[PDB]
Design brief:
The PDB classes it as membrane protein. The chain is mainly α. It has helices spanning 2-27, 35-57, 64-72, 78-103, 111-114, 131-152, 161-181, 187-196, 200-203, 206-230. The longest helix is centred in the first third of the chain and has 26 residues, at 2-27. 32% of the residues are buried.
Length: 231
Amino acid sequence: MFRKLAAECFGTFWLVFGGCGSAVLAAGFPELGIGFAGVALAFGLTVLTMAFAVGHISGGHFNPAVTIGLWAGGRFPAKEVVGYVIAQVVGGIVAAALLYLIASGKTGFDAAASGFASNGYGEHSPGGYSMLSALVVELVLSAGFLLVIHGATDKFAPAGFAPIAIGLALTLIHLISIPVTNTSVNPARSTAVAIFQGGWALEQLWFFWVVPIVGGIIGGLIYRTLLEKRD
């Protein structure tokens, strides 16, 4: 209840701080760009640690798409919905504020000002990350979270395996998804960037973001319907 809500909120702040810091840091990577590899290694470890730690501390799904899936299944906790909305809104501004602080002349200038969209190569990454490729990847990322959570929510969470399984896969996905398109990490981070970088011209991308979350809902929706069918 209150404890669970507080645990998720606390974890969100920590996750956002680490995500924003790593994101802004990557944007202003050192001239040598050597520290880039060191940061990536630390990020992966942190993600895994947070998943296991944040999991036992909250064990929350921590995802807007997941919350929606439950709603369709006839489950929509008021605390979860309220926390999700607040977390996203607050998390978005909080991340933007932190990023701006660094951009205040310190390495990690805003992508919009640099016109890097994020890090130079994004949804336009010729590495085969075009719209078609991005569409499949976006669905996989959203579906992956729902798939793991959906399953981990069925006597599939022995104790740490659930968070660890996703954590390990999450790091691997980010490791490749990063150099490919420099994917952020979650909707919260994306929202903060969209708030500022999501300029009308760039706002159009908002639709591209909707698909990812929507795609995940469709996958979870089918799973919920099937389960309800068996009853």
